[PDB]
RNA sequence: ACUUACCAACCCGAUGCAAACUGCGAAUACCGGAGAAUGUUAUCACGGGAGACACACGGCGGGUGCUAACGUCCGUC
RNA sequence: CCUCCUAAAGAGUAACGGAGGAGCACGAAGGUUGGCUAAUCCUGGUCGGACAUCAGGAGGUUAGUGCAAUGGCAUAAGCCAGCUUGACUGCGAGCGUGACGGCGCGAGCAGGUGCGAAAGCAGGUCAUAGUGAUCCGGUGGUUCUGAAUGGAAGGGCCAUC
RNA sequence: GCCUGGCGGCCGUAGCGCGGUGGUCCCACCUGACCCCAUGCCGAACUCAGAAGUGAAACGCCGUAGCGCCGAUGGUAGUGUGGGGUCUCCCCAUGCGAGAGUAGGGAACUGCCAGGCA
């Protein structure tokens, strides 16, 4: 919602003169956010993949997609066509709506927080964190829980370096130790 | 890869109107304008054409790239098809569903006596 | 261990360039579109190559893959 | 002594062994022994023209062999009657043509070289030949 | 082997009957399809498995 | 975690091999068309009568065997 | 019975030659419309291991094909979904392959259907294996025949076992 | 005449790559999404309504032989016919003659219709 706004009127010229940019559409703008679990375990019972699917789907405001597996990894007892996780795609409003009940109502939540990398950039411009338990969103509720899963956050951006793709997320209030 | 991929999607019927020798009525759409050309079988001459980038028809629209604007391509070009003496064609899509602005341009081709 | 073979399914071109074919002659017996259909020939299920016109078998390479087509040209 | 790791096929057709050679030009040493006849070379023959090549020098140089026995030769044991099948393999051959140069060797003077081939030539059922680098 | 003939029968009372096979243990429920029936000369449904 | 006289793939450069490898590729042979000379229609079709279906060596190309056999199995002359 | 090699660049071609498969499966894994495009490695990321899932990148089919191998396959024949029964019936120009029996390919026609706005596609499945002559019977259909005549039996014909 | 777009021919001397370059128009991103239609989540794609903004991405054009690609001549190999030998392999006469490679080329060419600046 805000952080739109707040990025057009106010990121963008932090970004636009700190890389003495020569046009507005170079700068990097947030494209997509997904939301990743993981899910392993539930490969015995189908109902511990679901439960994770709702807790997708209370973070964010649309509901997930229920991965398979692509292939067969006997290492993990996996096989083409059994889901092996779930996942959101966040885009426009919600992304960034998104954005903001995460970095300025989740991110304050950690134990012992101690900051947050800036090397987790993947060395084309795009952050990823991922956390270990699903309470820290607010609608999650704490007393409705029946196991700790943590997830996989990825905000991708139209950046090109992870020197600009910091400059962003910085002049987003975005931690970084 | 959003340009190739509409290519790519049009290929089997294209080849398709090749191998039949038909006259197909191709529609080439664009955010701003729509266009239409009614090209012979060997598929490298035009016979008849009609387009919003123009101004015999673009002043008579609010907007080029509208439902309505294709509608006045699709009742042009087979206006212009039918002086030639040109009434059974196969209509070509090119990749883009026949849902709206498509839709239009062949509806109102149809109504203006095009055999399809 | 060794001893075993298929009867031998008598494949390959049965009308050659310039032959002048009745219409429904194969032209070619393949595994595949080794050959693809021009104009005038259909492509059968088990991909024979037939003519649909009489007249002249026409081999020729087409197209970016440099594929090799054959088409009948009315003589 | 020689043999392929793994083979695509347990036997080989007989074959034949026509043409002039590839391989003809000493690329990695400055000397070698290159083949003026025709006719399989054997792994065993092939180790103890290396072992006696490589006893002339003593730790001196580098050795290269240029050929592989990669062919597999069957025969039938004693008391077979023909056919019922093809006969297992007992041994691995390299087919050579005349120009092949064989092993190739530095490190060395020419005239140790010479010793060298000569002693492993006597090793080998083809006649052979010494021969040196060429530049372009 | 496995899969077994049945007929598949014309509910146009004709008589006419197409054949095929089916799996029994799968699908264990009635083949009804829409089929051409050569006495009435119509699209018709016909109906059995065994 | 430090190293390691052992090992080390992918990639790069160089060197070869292949009946069941081919990003190349002949000569020949085969199909078809045209044209001349040439040849006792040498061609095809239908019909009457058959015999024959143990082959052999040689050359070429090969399998098999030992690129052994006046050996064995194909192709072609 | 199928595939490759032997097999000598048309076909075909033998050995108690070299190597592998088949004796099925599928009412969807078939038809059609619409849509999509892999393997593998790299970088980064919660439980994560060298390999689950996510994102990008390089890659360009090094994947995939219900099952061998070969030839094919991006206009995909490969993945997904919607609607469906053309896995239609009668025929069939003409070809192919076979000593024959036979096997195969097939535009187009008639009738009726499905998909699709339409052009069109569909007479089973990417193809090539997945099979068994005749006799004797069985079942259903069909008033063809019906040993004086009317019927019936049996026979024929069509479909199938 | 120059620029753009659509459709083709041709199918790498046509491709990748690299460096530069273009926004009147066209094209691209782009803005928004009650309704049409859409996501096995997502207006990302499909799609409809639009035109503040930018030519960043893409696309196109221009340039540059790092690569791919094309590619002689000559020789080499093989081979039909005939002949011959020291015959598991070769040679001779004649005809056909590669592949690899070398020099070298090479930053496609061309058509139809449309539009726009002149
Ligand atoms: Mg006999
Ligand atoms: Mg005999
Ligand atoms: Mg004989
Ligand atoms: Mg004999
Ligand atoms: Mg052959
Ligand atoms: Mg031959
Ligand atoms: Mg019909
Ligand atoms: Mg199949
Ligand atoms: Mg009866
Ligand atoms: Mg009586
Ligand atoms: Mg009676």
């Given at each position: 919602?805000?952080?739109?706004?707040?990025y057009?009127?106010?990121?963008?010229?932090?970004?636009?003169?700190?890389?003495?940019?020569?046009?507005?559409?170079?700068?990097?703008?947030?494209?997509?956010?997904?939301?990743?679990?993981?899910?392993?375990?539930?490969?015995?019972?189908?109902?511990?993949l679901?439960?994770?699917?709702?807790?997708?789907?209370?973070?964010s405001?649309?509901?997930?997609?229920?991965?398979?597996?692509?292939?067969?990894?006997?290492?993990?007892?996996?096989?083409?066509?059994?889901?092996?996780?779930?996942?959101?795609?966040?885009?426009?409003?919600?992304?960034?709506?998104?954005?903001?009940?995460?970095?300025?109502?989740?991110?304050?939540?950690?134990?012992?927080?101690?900051?947050?990398?800036?090397?987790?950039?993947?060395?084309?411009?795009?952050?990823?964190?991922?956390?270990?338990?699903?309470?820290?969103?607010?609608?999650?509720?704490?007393?409705?829980?029946?196991?700790?899963?943590?997830?996989?956050?990825?905000?991708?951006?139209?950046?090109?370096?992870?020197?600009?793709?910091?400059?962003?997320?910085?002049?987003?209030?975005?931690?970084?130790? | 890869?959003?340009?190739?991929?509409?290519?790519?999607?049009?290929?089997?019927?294209?080849?398709?109107?090749?191998?039949?020798?038909?006259?197909?009525?191709?529609?080439?759409?664009?955010?701003?304008h729509?266009?239409?050309?009614?090209?012979?079988?060997?598929?490298?001459?035009?016979?008849?054409?009609?387009?919003?980038?123009?101004?015999?028809?673009?002043?008579?629209?609010?907007?080029?790239?509208?439902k309505?604007a294709?509608?006045?391509?699709?009742?042009?070009?087979?206006?212009?098809?039918?002086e030639?003496?040109?009434?059974?064609?196969?209509?070509?899509?090119?990749?883009?569903?026949?849902?709206?602005?498509?839709?239009?341009?062949?509806?109102?081709?149809?109504?203006?006596?095009?055999?399809? | 261990?060794?001893?075993?073979?298929?009867?031998?399914?008598?494949?390959?071109?049965?009308?050659?360039?310039?032959?002048?074919?009745?219409?429904?002659?194969?032209?070619?017996?393949?595994?595949?579109?080794?050959?693809?259909?021009?104009?005038?020939?259909?492509?059968?299920?088990?991909?024979?190559?037939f003519?649909?016109?009489?007249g002249?078998?026409?081999?020729?390479?087409?197209?970016?893959?440099?594929?090799?087509?054959?088409?009948?040209?009315?003589? | 002594?020689?043999?392929?790791?793994?083979?695509?096929?347990?036997?080989?057709?007989?074959?034949?062994?026509?043409?002039?050679?590839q391989?003809?030009?000493?690329?990695?040493?400055?000397?070698?022994?290159?083949?003026?006849?025709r006719?399989?070379?054997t792994?065993?023959?092939?180790?103890?023209?290396?072992?006696?090549?490589?006893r002339?020098?003593?730790?001196?140089?580098?050795?290269?062999?240029?050929?592989?026995?990669?062919?597999?030769?069957?025969?039938?044991?004693?008391?077979?009657?023909?056919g019922?099948?093809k006969?297992?393999?007992?041994?691995?051959?390299?087919?050579?043509?005349?120009?092949?140069?064989?092993?190739?060797m530095?490190?060395?003077?020419?005239?140790?070289?010479?010793?060298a081939?000569?002693?492993?030539?006597?090793?080998?059922?083809?006649?052979?030949?010494?021969?040196?680098?060429?530049?372009? | 082997?496995?899969?077994?003939?049945?007929?598949?029968?014309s509910?146009?009372?004709?008589?006419?009957?197409?054949?095929?096979?089916?799996?029994?243990?799968?699908?264990?429920?009635?083949?009804?399809?829409?089929?051409?029936d050569?006495?009435?000369?119509?699209?018709?449904?016909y109906?059995?498995?065994?």
């Amino acid at each position: 919602a805000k952080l739109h706004d707040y990025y057009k009127d106010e990121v963008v010229k932090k970004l636009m003169t700190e890389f003495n940019y020569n046009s507005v559409m170079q700068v990097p703008r947030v494209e997509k956010i997904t939301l990743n679990m993981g899910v392993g375990e539930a490969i015995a019972d189908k109902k511990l993949l679901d439960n994770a699917a709702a807790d997708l789907a209370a973070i964010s405001g649309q509901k997930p997609l229920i991965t398979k597996a692509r292939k067969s990894v006997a290492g993990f007892k996996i096989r083409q066509g059994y889901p092996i996780g779930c996942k959101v795609t966040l885009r426009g409003e919600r992304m960034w709506e998104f954005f903001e009940r995460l970095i300025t109502i989740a991110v304050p939540r950690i134990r012992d927080f101690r900051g947050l990398s800036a090397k987790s950039f993947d060395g084309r411009g795009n952050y990823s964190m991922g956390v270990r338990e699903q309470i820290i969103f607010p609608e999650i509720d704490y007393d409705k829980v029946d196991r700790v899963r943590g997830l996989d956050i990825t905000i991708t951006t139209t950046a090109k370096s992870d020197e600009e793709g910091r400059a962003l997320l910085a002049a987003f209030d975005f931690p970084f130790r | 890869d959003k340009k190739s991929a509409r290519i790519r999607r049009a290929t089997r019927a294209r080849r398709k109107l090749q191998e039949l020798g038909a006259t197909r009525l191709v529609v080439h759409r664009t955010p701003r304008h729509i266009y239409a050309q009614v090209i012979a079988p060997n598929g490298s001459e035009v016979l008849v054409a009609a387009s919003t980038v123009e101004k015999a028809i673009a002043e008579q629209l609010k907007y080029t790239g509208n439902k309505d604007a294709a509608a006045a391509v699709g009742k042009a070009v087979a206006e212009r098809a039918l002086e030639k003496g040109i009434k059974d064609v196969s209509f070509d899509r090119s990749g883009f569903q026949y849902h709206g602005r498509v839709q239009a341009l062949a509806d109102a081709a149809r109504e203006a006596g095009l055999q399809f | 261990r060794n001893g075993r073979d298929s009867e031998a399914k008598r494949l390959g071109v049965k009308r050659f360039g310039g032959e002048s074919v009745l219409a429904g002659s194969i032209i070619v017996r393949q595994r595949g579109t080794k050959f693809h259909a021009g104009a005038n020939v259909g492509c059968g299920r088990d991909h024979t190559l037939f003519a649909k016109a009489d007249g002249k078998v026409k081999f020729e390479v087409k197209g970016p893959k440099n594929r090799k087509f054959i088409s009948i040209e009315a003589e | 002594m020689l043999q392929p790791k793994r083979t695509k096929f347990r036997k080989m057709h007989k074959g034949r062994n026509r043409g002039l050679a590839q391989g003809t030009d000493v690329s990695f040493g400055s000397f070698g022994l290159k083949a003026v006849g025709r006719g399989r070379l054997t792994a065993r023959q092939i180790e103890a023209a290396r072992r006696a090549m490589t006893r002339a020098v003593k730790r001196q140089g580098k050795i290269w062999i240029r050929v592989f026995p990669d062919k597999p030769i069957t025969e039938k044991p004693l008391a077979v009657r023909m056919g019922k099948g093809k006969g297992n393999v007992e041994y691995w051959v390299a087919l050579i043509q005349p120009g092949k140069v064989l092993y190739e060797m530095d490190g060395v003077p020419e005239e140790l070289a010479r010793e060298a081939f000569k002693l492993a030539a006597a090793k080998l059922p083809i006649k052979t030949t010494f021969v040196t680098k060429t530049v372009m | 082997g496995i899969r077994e003939k049945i007929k598949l029968v014309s509910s146009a009372g004709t008589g006419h009957f197409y054949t095929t096979t089916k799996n029994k243990r799968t699908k264990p429920e009635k083949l009804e399809l829409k089929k051409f029936d050569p006495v009435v000369r119509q699209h018709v449904i016909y109906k059995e498995a065994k």
